[PDB]
Each structure stands twice: as structure tokens, then as C-alpha cells.
Design a binder for this molecule. Structure first.
Ligand SMILES: Nc1ncnc2c1ncn2[C@@H]1O[C@H](COP(=O)(O)OP(=O)(O)O)[C@@H](O)[C@H]1O
Ligand SMILES: Nc1ncnc2c1ncn2[C@@H]1O[C@H](COP(=O)(O)OP(=O)(O)O)[C@@H](O)[C@H]1O
Lengths: 473, 473
């Protein structure tokens, strides 16, 4: 038994499927605008704005929908970013294409035009950006704040934004004549019962553990250990293995002993501390997880009180800890989704070296280049590029509607202001509800995120229009 | 198989759910007004006014309702207080918002206005309060009586209210330049066959247990014990362990031995008495739960007759026992729900240092600030703040209806009296049925309870209006 889907109706089925998952996500384009909740047959409950977190658990009848979703999920695994933009832009590209099919243009022509215009967009993004460097700290703070916002505590966390910017500046280097970073150089530590005021940067490694042993050690080495630190003859051999640590490793100054009972008395009579931490310490200290070799080095080691409880510190400088003591485990959980995402957002700026506005105004400027390229092509392909420009202009029309404005009137006012070239960066403000300068408002995005969004959208819609027939076996 | 809820109809479903649990609790806003009964499929029966005790056992089809209930239950776990006010205020905020949706204001705008006004309310509460201190004993007695009332025995328990106020005054200290208390410094003891006249305060620890041993001991130490107090050689070792208590612990004066058979004769030939009590004794005496160490100290120890039967007493001064000998176990059970709740109510006053009226008049005064802030904002947001003020004015309209008055007429009369600024504290009296001075009537509430009520309500209704879509998997 085998099942088949055919002809114009196969396009109407697959276009309907992508319009359906668009409709299921259209309202949630952020940052202000309503959110969605998902519940288990076990009776469990979740509330989220985040499309990537939604598409982790959506329900998917048509295979082409599942495949488009897979492409979006891959885009998020590369970036964590743009994930809602890609699906929405794909959805509107697909719908506006349906308006051509009544004029009976053969689908391969549309797939030509929708591919060709994407060259002009991709070129135009690389034209209009401005440069940025590690030194440009207030612009980096604007970038961090734009990634951090849509939770009111982002105003209080404005000093926490400066902490991660300086942590990046210490993590950052040059490679390929470009500023160079990755996230995994930054350590984070996390305890409850604190506040935003507890938060710190360390320029070193933090050991979030509580221990006769000394509070302070200086100019010393470090021992890293996997797991913990003839009957009578073999009994004493495992006593000797303690002093065999002293005999060479203490004689060279390894004043702290870090483990994943006789030593607890003996070393107190030297500090002992109870895999990722041992890797971070191996990166910072040069140590490795007996042998007389494998030793790490540091100038300072301490245990100190940090809010409600004690913590241990080791103080290579190219890795940096930041310290969080939040009020609750709820705050730690959301501090990943805020802070590690913000750090990654900044790193993608650092590795781009260039930046663009975000007020939808990048998109409107692309629309103005497109309507000047299309008359040069002039074939039937022209109706496809004019459609593409109108469909991407169809994005901010949605974004304004989530700010409750009447969209058409604000769209025409915006385009009228943009027509005179009055600004490079006029766009649509979601709080004042007005056409405003989006750059002085401080709303910034990396150009890479636009490129990967527009790319993933065009890839998805070609994989819809290019399919004639489905068979199942 | 997956289930989905959508569009305007998802709001009408979720608004209907919160209107339903409001309707299921609307009539029970206290203190005079009808109550509700809950019965098991096992045939068991309960009668209560207390919403927190009701929401311990309600039936909950919609998840958003369950989640709003969870927020109310959390509010009660923090406070035990305000629990009905939060739900009712949320319910009316939700209903009055429905009257805007026919004018097609986008829900995000309403959520803006309902958030913005809450700043003006929160500021206004902190403006109008009056200060209070430990010294202000008759005002503290009014506070206690207002927490104690709606059981007629509160008139007889007016001296019992003075006992817990003085127990607090002995428990209380300064911390952070503020008067400081917590409940867990007060011991309570509980026997049957007595009366309100049996009740006492002790400035010490009471041991509610009946024992050749002496009736009185003075200037002595205390032994606290976990659980009770080579065959022949090890037999006698457990005889020696009795005199080993004498050999150091009696030689230093530990005349009472407190346990969670040879000693019953031997010590009579010293007092022996048969986890929370041992912790309370550890707090008062400095003792700890053989060793020669761990000893407690007190100036006086006694066993004495207390109504129907004997009781033992130990007499650090910063913990205080109060003594209850009620007529029945029914009285002890309700004496938690009265007395420990009243003590907590007072402590929340002590730690606020400030106080507000309760006659609904705090709420009406907020309504008068709001209608003067709203014309400055002036956008579409104005229709949301004017609605919020009208909806919170909608609270006392219910409270008067539980006193059987015709509500509209009393509301207009009240607002007319409040308009002229005739009083800071005119409100609505539930017994005389008249507009009266609520402060001279002695009806007092802590400002914290209002803050946490208005806060939890606004949090709940935003979590309703902010949801567009539900999916179940
Ligand atoms: N506060 C803001 N003001 C204006 N535009 C914004 C704001 N926040 C985000 N945007 C725009 O919204 C789009 C990003 O959508 P968003 O849901 O934030 O994506 P993501 O969830 O991946 O961050 C871009 O056009 C971005 O510039
Ligand atoms: N005897 C009273 N006279 C006037 N208002 C009262 C009286 N008792 C309570 N109130 C008011 O009722 C509201 C408290 O509702 P209530 O059911 O008592 O809450 P709770 O059950 O948490 O004590 C507040 O407005 C409070 O001031």
C-alpha cells in the first residue's frame, strides 16, 4: 500500500503547511508581544517566548514542514540566534509567491528570481554596516543591553553587562588579523541567596566549593587529581603514596590539592579542595590530572566568604571566571538564557568587526535597493523580484502590529521618510510607537545574524517550491 | 495526538476560567459573610471561611487557573495573609479588562497600562502610612484584636492578646536599625480541661510533662539527652555510666536530667523529666544534647500543678513560652489558627514599623491618586489606567454587599465624603452599616500585606493576558 500527492494540489498542500507553522508563530515575533504555553499529557506546564525552545517540542504532520523545521533547528544549533526571523521570513516569501501562481508562471522561474535577488541583499548588507572594535566599550555596552533586554532587571544588570564586556576583552585576541574570541574561555559560578550586587569578574578561576586548612596561599603550585586523592606491606604502600606527594610535589611548592581521609589531617598539619573545573584549571594553571609531573602554577590561592557561604579561588591569564550569586535557582536558570546568550551575541560581533541597525531599517533599505535592481533584469523574472521586495517589506508590517500600532499608516509614513534619504537609520520604535532614529536609541545587531537569517529563509522556501510530487511506501 | 487553543477565543476561555474561580470565592471575602464546605468521596466533611484552606483542596481543569492558584498558594506560603484579597483583586482586574477588548485595543497596551499604574499605587501606600513601635502597646493591642476577631471569644482573649504582645516585646530586638522579631522564638504549650483564664506567659521554657523527685531546684545546670538517658564487665560499664554523670556533671550542679530505670531510684535518692523541646532548651539554657560538656544553665527549675495536672518549668532570656490550657482539643486546634497567625501578623507589623487603615479606605485613596495621574499619560494607555482605578474601586463594592447594604448607594456616599478630604480614614463599617472613621474603630493592617496583595494580583493577571496560544502534546 502506497500513497501519492500530485500536481498544483501538492504545491497548495505544502504552501498551506508552511503558512500553518507561520501562523502558529507569527504573533510571537519579539521583544514586546504575546507568548505561548506548552503542556504535557503528563500534566506538566511551560511558558516561553523563544521559538527555538518552542520548536524543540512542536507537533509535525507533514514531512516538508518537519524538514523546514529541521533546517531552522540546525540554524539555531549553529547560532542560537535569528531562529524566529528565519521562519517568519520564509513564511511570507512562500505566501507572496502564491499570488504569482494564479498568473501561471512556471515554478522554476520563481525559484530563479528568488535566488537572484538574494545576491543583491547579501551585497547590500555588506555595504551599509559600520565597523566596531574591542576598544569601543559603550557601543559594546549597547550591544550587550540589546541582547540582555526584555526583562526589566536589564537596567540593574547594566554593570553586569560591563563585567562580561571586560571579561571578553581579557579573553579576546587577534587571529587572522581579526579580533578573536570563543565562549568556552569564560568560567561561570552560581550560588543562591544573593543578588545582582553580588556579581563579579575574577580574571582567574573560581572553585565554588566549601572546605585546619589555611585561608591563604601564595606563589605556589597546584595538584589536580582524578577522583579522590602482602596485606600489611600493601596497606602501608597506600600510606606512603601521601608522603610521596610531599617528597617531590610539595618540595616544589604545590600548596593546594584539588580532588574530583589521612590527608585531611596530614595536610592541615596545605589546602585540599573537594571534570570541567579540572579542565579550566588545566587551561589556567598549566596543570594536568602518582607522577611528579602534571603540576599547575598560580600566584595566589584563597578561600573567602561570598555572601551566604565560603568559596575558593585560584588567581595563563587567557581564561576568566565571572561570579554569580543569585537569589534563587530560578535566577541561575534564566541567567544562562540571558548572560551566556549575550556573551555569544557579543562574540559574534567581535568576530564580525562590523555592525548594523536593527529597527527593521536594514530590511527597509534592502527593499529600496531591490526596487532599483529589478528593472535591469526585465524578464518574467522581474515579477518575482518585485514580489520578494514586497514580501520582505512585509516583515516590519508585522513587527509594528505587535506594538499595537495601526501598521499600514506607520509603514507609509516610514517609507516616505526613508525615501528622501533623511536617515540611514530611521525605523520603528516599539515603545514610543513612532518613527525614530534606531541608532541613537542604541538598538544594535550583528550583520552575520541577518545574513544567516535571509540565507536560511531562501534555502527553506526553495525546498518547498522545487518539489512536484510525494510518494510514500 | 495534539490539542490547540487559539485567537480571541483563547483569551475568552482563560478570562472565563479566572472569572470562574473568582465567582467560586467572591462571596467569602470576610470577616462577616457566608462560608463554604468541602466533602470527600470517602464521606468526610469540612467547614471553612479560609481561602488558603479552600485552595489546599480545589478542583482545577484549566492549567492557567492551576498556575494562578499556585501563585496564590506561594503568596500564602510566604505570608499566610492576603490570600483571598489577591485572588479577588485579580479577578476584577481581569473582568474589567474584558470591557476594553470590544474596543479592539491590542492586549500588549493593556498590559502596559496595568503595569504602569501599579507604580503609583505602590508609591501611594508608602506615602499615607503612620509609624509604630514596640512601645505603642494599645495600638499593638488593636492590631492583635483585628487579627484575632471574627470569633466572639476575642473579647475574653483581650488579656491573651496582651500576653502575646508582651511576649513579642521580650522576643523583639533591633536589627538593621529596625525592630526585629521572628515567630520561632516563642514556645507554646497545650493541655485540655482548662479555660482562657488558665493562659499565661512565662519569660522562660515550659516542659509540658508529668513525672521521689524534688518539686523545686535552684541555681543549677541542665542535662539534655538524645532518646532515653565480656558480659559482666560490660553489664557494669552501663551502671558506671550513671555515676559518670554525677562525677563531673552533678559536681557542677546539673540538678535536672531531661530525656527524649536505675536512675529513677538513684536520682530520687535530682530531677529526671520524660526534639523541638530540646532545641528550645538549647536556645534558652545554652545546653546541647556521655560527655562532661554540652551543659545548660538556669536560675530556677520547678514542677507545679497547672489546672487539672502537673507541669515542669525551666526559668538566655530571648525565648519565651506562653501557656495554654484550653477546654478541649478543638480549642487548641483553633488556637493555632488564631494565636500563631496573630503573632505572625504582629511580627509583620514590627518589621514594617509603619501601618495603614483597613476599611477599604486605603483602596479608595489609591483610586483618588490614580484618577489624577492618568491624564498626564494621555495615550491609549489612559483607558487602561482609568479602568484599573475603577476596578480596584470595585473591591469595597463587594465588601459592603457581604454586610447586606445596598452597595451603590453606600459607595457614592463614601466617595462624596472622601472627595472633600473630610478624613484620611473614612471607610465602610460592616456592623453599623455606615460610613465611619475606621481608625478610631481600631481596625488596623500592615502595609506589607497590601503591597504583596496588589503585587500578586498584577502578576497573575499579566500571566493571563500575555498568553495568545496553548498547545498540548
Ligand atoms: N527593542 C527592540 N527595538 C526594536 N527592534 C528590536 C528590538 N528588539 C529586537 N528587535 C528586532 O527584532 C528582530 C529580532 O527578533 P527577536 O525575536 O529578538 O529575535 P531573537 O529572539 O533571536 O532575539 C530584529 O529586527 C531586531 O532588530
Ligand atoms: N472588622 C473589619 N472591619 C472592616 N474591614 C475589615 C474587617 N476585617 C477585615 N477587614 C478588611 O477585609 C480585608 C481583609 O480580608 P480578610 O478576609 O480578612 O483577609 P484574611 O482572611 O487574609 O484576613 C481588608 O480590607 C481588611 O482591612
Amino acid at each position: 500500500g502506497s500513497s501519492r500527492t500530485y500536481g498544483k494540489e501538492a504545491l497548495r498542500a505544502n504552501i498551506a503547511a508552511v503558512k500553518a507553522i507561520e501562523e502558529a508563530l507569527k504573533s510571537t515575533y519579539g521583544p514586546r508581544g504575546m507568548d505561548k504555553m506548552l503542556v504535557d499529557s503528563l500534566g506538566d506546564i511551560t511558558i516561553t517566548n523563544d521559538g527555538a525552545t518552542i520548536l524543540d517540542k512542536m507537533d509535525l504532520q507533514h514531512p516538508t514542514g518537519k524538514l523546514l523545521v529541521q533546517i531552522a533547528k540546525g540554524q539555531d544549533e549553529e547560532t542560537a540566534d535569528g531562529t524566529k526571523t528565519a521562519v517568519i521570513l520564509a513564511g511570507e516569501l512562500a505566501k507572496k509567491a502564491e499570488d504569482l501562481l494564479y498568473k501561471e508562471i512556471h515554478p522554476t522561474i520563481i525559484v530563479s528570481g528568488y535566488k537572484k535577488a538574494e545576491e543583491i541583499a547579501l551585497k547590500t548588507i555588506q555595504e551599509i554596516a559600520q565597523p566596531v572594535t574591542i576598544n569601543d566599550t559603550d557601543v559594546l555596552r549597547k550591544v550587550a543591553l540589546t541582547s540582555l533586554g526584555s526583562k526589566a532587571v536589564a537596567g540593574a544588570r547594566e554593570y553586569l553587562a560591563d563585567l562580561v564586556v571586560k571579561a571578553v576583552a581579557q579573553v579576546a585576541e587577534l587571529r587572522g588579523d581579526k579580533w578573536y574570541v570563543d565562549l568556552d574561555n569564560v568560567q561561570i559560578v552560581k550560588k543562591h541567596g544573593g543578588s545582582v550586587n553580588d556579581t563579579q569578574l575574577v580574571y582567574g578561576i573560581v572553585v565554588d566549593k566549601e572546605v585546619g586548612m589555611p585561608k591563604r596561599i601564595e606563589n605556589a603550585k597546584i595538584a589536580l587529581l582524578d577522583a579522590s586523592l602482602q596485606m600489611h606491606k600493601f596497606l602501608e604502600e597506600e600510606e606512603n603514596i601521601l608522603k610521596e606527594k610531599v617528597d617531590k610535589i610539595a618540595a616544589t611548592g604545590a600548596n593546594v590539592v584539588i580532588c574530583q581521609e589521612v590527608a585531611q589531617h596530614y595536610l592541615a598539619k596545605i589546602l585540599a579542595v573537594r571534570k570541567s573545573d579540572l579542565e579550566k584549571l588545566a587551561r589556567a594553571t598549566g596543570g594536568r590530572v602518582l607522577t611528579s609531573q602534571d603540576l599547575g602554577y598560580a600566584a595566589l590561592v584563597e578561600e573567602r566568604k561570598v555572601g551566604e557561604d565560603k568559596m575558593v579561588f585560584v588567581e595563563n591569564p587567557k581564561s576568566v571566571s565571572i561570579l554569580i550569586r543569585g537569589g534563587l535557582e530560578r535566577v541561575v536558570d534564566e541567567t544562562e538564557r540571558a548572560l551566556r546568550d549575550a556573551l555569544g551575541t557579543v562574540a559574534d560581533v567581535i568576530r564580525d568587526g562590523r555592525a548594523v541597525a536593527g529597527g527593521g531599517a536594514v530590511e527597509i533599505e534592502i527593499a529600496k535597493r531591490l526596487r532599483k535592481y529589478a528593472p535591469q533584469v526585465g524578464g518574467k523574472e522581474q515579477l518575482a523580484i518585485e514580489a520578494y521586495a514586497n514580501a520582505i517589506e512585509g516583515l516590519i508590517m508585522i513587527l509594528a502590529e505587535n506594538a499595537g500600532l495601526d501598521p499600514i499608516d506607520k509603514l507609509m509614513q516610514l517609507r516616505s521618510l526613508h525615501e528622501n534619504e533623511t536617515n540611514k537609520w530611521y525605523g520603528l520604535n516599539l515603545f514610543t510607537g513612532n518613527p525614530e532614529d534606531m541608532w541613537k536609541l542604541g538598538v544594535i545587531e550583528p550583520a552575520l545574524v541577518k545574513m544567516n537569517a535571509v540565507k536560511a529563509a531562501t534555502e527553506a522556501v526553495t525546498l518547498v517550491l522545487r518539489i512536484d510530487d510525494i510518494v510514500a511506501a
